[PDB]
Design a protein around this ligand. Structure first.
Ligand code: HEM
Ligand code: HEM
Ligand SMILES: N=C(Nc1cccc(O[C@H]2CN[C@H](COc3ccc(/N=C(/N)c4cccs4)cc3)C2)c1)c1cccs1
Ligand SMILES: N=C(Nc1cccc(O[C@H]2CN[C@H](COc3ccc(/N=C(/N)c4cccs4)cc3)C2)c1)c1cccs1
Ligand SMILES: C[C@H](O)[C@H](O)[C@H]1CNc2nc(N)[nH]c(=O)c2N1
Ligand SMILES: C[C@H](O)[C@H](O)[C@H]1CNc2nc(N)[nH]c(=O)c2N1
Ligand SMILES: [Zn+2]
Lengths: 407, 411
């Protein structure tokens, strides 16, 4: 019931008790581990509200005070009456910070308490959403000195009036299927790119076209908006040794901003809660650039390096992979756009785990996601045992809006 | 209940029904996943069902389920258990058993090979000198002058827990490590404690960086005895780089034959506590883990110095660069000397094909992603993108505690 995790490189053992708080289910059982699977009413609401308010009041050292007992009654009265309730600003901010704190798949959590929360619960239209989003993008970008932020739209009510951002990230590049059977730009975004086109967006039909926002307010049909180019910080990708690297025509955007997740706080559901931080270099260099189903540039890069591509055992893929990732980091750094390398990020995460174990009694962590997609064992997280479990407040997946929406 | 796994690169979806046959426990529950935790005397009572289940699987494999030969064997095993408290496997059942323990090893990327395994029956062995003899023969057979052949040698099973056969070595061939008075380590730091035991037992240590350790062998619950493997049987590969001529001067080498000697093999409820098995190396085992773990030989800094990379910031990726060069060197050195090795691209691609084959013919393939994904360049191998289901089947290889922790010393 008290659980130990060991770091096999340093012999540091931590004791986890925080998992006993856990409420939601993992997908695993005593007979089967599902650790590598990507996706494994009034009566329901009051327990959820109570559990949340309890941890809130405990966090401000006011557990069992009249202020606590008063607020519990007030929300209870509100649920009895309205079948929902509203969070105080303080509770909203605490909830958002903790949803990040609880994100077991996130290596960047040493930062969790520095999150700027933008309360957009007063928003009513897609134009208003567009406005809040531009303000977030400009704030978070901060001319390259990136700052973590979340913008929180109105919570789910009856579920026929959902606020949604249809985009998967606020800033992403378009994807087009071509006569060749090949794909121009980002293949991950082909379907969304089709929705935008068929919604009215005239597409430049290039390799790096910033997608338009498709914003749904109050369950209405979503609407297109171009983010002002001056608010989209992009980085041309060059190499500090290889002159020809720039000739590849590669670029990426500075601001990673997830817009398709659902924030749950005290039972309340925020279906539009775009959040942003900054990149770890591997996300772009390894996954975005080198996944076979993404920009898949390994072949073209190895060619320019004149590597022996005859045999897998020359490790030509591995050599090209390193160079690409050197280039991503060198470029962002040269242009003063915040980025973290995988060595620095994983080192920070170990330190964060240690903080959380002593301060909180644990830290839910999903090893499969935390270990970087290159050079796994030369980062400290590889050698760190992790316990994965689900705490609330949380960010959760939710299905893509087009499958759900009633036009 | 059918369970689906998806490859996210290819969209290939597979359906698992084999997990239904799993009895043993994973470590996980509905509230916690322990997928990254390294380690998450039987009576007549528990023994007959374990035997029955195994023999049913065996007779099914040979298309003789429910036959007279099947039923007679069940009867014969039952009578033998009730009168002797244990039973002996037929040669055929032992072979089938050892192969299946490999087939079922969820952490093994090399399983496409599972059915090609040479099984040496050493159950007539009685002494440590006899064990040495068996192990020498296994090493010479497996090595095959560089053309490695997978093999397992199986010593007598556990009886009362007081007469165990054990190989004290964690691998048959491995380098000594020596903790120095100044706190530095000479040789392989992973093997310091075992090295210390060998010395105390009487081994004369050459005290170098790549000293092959002596075998420490326990027969029949007796105190273990030391033996030196004849050097002519220990194939080694000096490590050099195809382009970097200074690489040879790092003084590196490795042995060709990886041979795990400290696991326990369970077949039909029987426990074989000494069952050394060997295959061949995937290159990253040596180039990434043995050479570059901070806790092992730790050669990254010295390699990067000689490559004259920018070492002042991690964001130059000097470590990642040096890592790839070392791994090229390992593969080049093995291939040039014609010692079998497989690179992680080739080995992971083969595993995916094995896995798909297993889902189709067997209804599943238990796999532990944490272990199957290579320790470098993870997402440029197809296994990174493959969902896997991890569950425990028997026959199985299992961990057991190091023997110095449990052994009753006779003196
Ligand atoms: C400050 C800089 C940050 C860095 C460098 C960082 C790093 C990462 C990385 C590399 C992943 C894996 C992404 C993938 O492979 O798809 C991730 C996952 C995640 N991050 Fe962070 N992160 C940071 C800030 C944040 C912030 C501000 C939030 C929310 C407020 C957050 C919430 C999450 C969530 C919810 C996931 C998992 C998404 C999923 O399950 O698919 N991150 N993060
Ligand atoms: C034929 C060539 C083979 C290759 C390239 C191969 C590859 C591997 C690798 C890379 C690992 C992970 C090792 C580690 O990180 O510690 C492993 C684990 C394992 N392999 Fe294979 N293997 C092969 C043959 C075999 C054979 C012949 C057996 C037994 C008959 C076997 C049984 C296992 C077991 C039981 C584990 C897990 C060890 C543990 O849990 O600590 N392997 N293998
Ligand atoms: N649907 C697909 N597969 C699939 C399945 C499950 C999850 C998934 O992506 C999630 C994982 N994760 C992504 C969102 O989470 C992220 C993304 C980036 C990220 N990176 C950062 N540095 C930050 C973003 C925001 C703050 S930090 C941090 C979190 C989005 C894709 C396919 C696509 C194309 C063909 S099939
Ligand atoms: N005691 C430690 N931690 C630890 C905890 C659990 C397991 C473990 O190592 C096992 C896992 N794994 C190893 C045995 O399994 C193997 C090993 C090598 C191997 N390689 C091959 N290609 C083959 C060998 C035989 C047939 S193929 C295949 C399987 C031995 C180490 C530490 C060591 C150093 C600092 S802390
Ligand atoms: C099947 C497997 O779970 C899947 O490929 C995962 C593995 N680990 C990951 N880790 C991160 N950070 N991001 C990912 O998208 C994935 N993909
Ligand atoms: C903590 C973690 O589970 C541990 O470091 C594992 C990760 N994956 C591994 N995978 C392999 N093949 N071998 C290992 O030793 C490890 N170590
Ligand atoms: Zn699990």
């Amino acid at each position: 019931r008290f659980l130990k995790v060991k770091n096999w490189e340093t012999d540091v053992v931590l004791t986890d008790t925080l998992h006993l708080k856990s409420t939601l289910e993992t997908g695993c059982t005593e007979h089967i581990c599902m650790g590598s699977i990507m996706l494994p009413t009034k009566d329901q609401l009051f327990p959820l509200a109570k559990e949340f308010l309890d941890q809130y009041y405990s966090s401000i050292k006011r557990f069992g005070s009249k202020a606590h007992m008063d607020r519990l009654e007030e929300v209870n009265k509100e649920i009895e009456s309205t079948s929902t309730y509203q969070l105080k600003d303080t509770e909203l901010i605490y909830g958002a910070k903790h949803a990040w704190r609880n994100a077991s798949r996130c290596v960047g959590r040493i930062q969790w308490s520095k999150l700027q929360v933008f309360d957009a619960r007063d928003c009513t239209t897609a134009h208003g959403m567009f406005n809040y989003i531009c303000n977030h993008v400009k704030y978070a970008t901060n001319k390259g000195n990136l700052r973590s932020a979340i913008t929180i739209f109105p919570q789910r009510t009856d579920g026929k009036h959902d606020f949604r951002v249809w985009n998967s990230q606020l800033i992403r590049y378009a994807g087009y299927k071509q006569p060749d059977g090949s794909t121009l730009g980002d293949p991950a975004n082909v379907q969304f790119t089709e929705i935008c086109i068929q919604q009215g967006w005239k597409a430049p039909r290039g390799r790096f076209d910033v997608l338009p926002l498709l914003l749904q307010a109050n369950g209405n049909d979503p609407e297109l908006f171009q983010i002002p180019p001056e608010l989209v910080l992009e980085v041309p990708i060059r190499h500090p040794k290889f002159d020809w690297f720039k000739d590849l025509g590669l670029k990426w955007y500075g601001l990673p901003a997830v817009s398709n997740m659902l924030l749950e706080i005290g039972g309340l559901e925020f279906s539009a809660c775009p959040f942003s931080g900054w990149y770890m270099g591997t996300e772009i260099g390894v996954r975005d650039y080198c996944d076979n189903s993404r920009y898949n540039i390994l072949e073209e890069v190895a060619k320019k390096m004149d590597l022996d591509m005859r045999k897998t055992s020359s490790l030509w893929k591995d050599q090209a992979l390193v160079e690409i990732n050197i280039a991503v980091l060198y470029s962002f750094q040269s242009d003063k756009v915040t980025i973290v390398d995988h060595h620095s990020a994983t080192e920070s995460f170990i330190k964060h785990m240690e903080n959380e174990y002593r301060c909180r009694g644990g830290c839910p962590a999903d090893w499969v996601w935390i270990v970087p997609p290159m050079s796994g064992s030369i980062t400290p997280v590889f050698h760190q045992e992790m316990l994965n479990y689900r705490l609330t407040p949380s960010f959760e997946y939710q299905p893509d809006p087009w499958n759900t929406h009633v036009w």
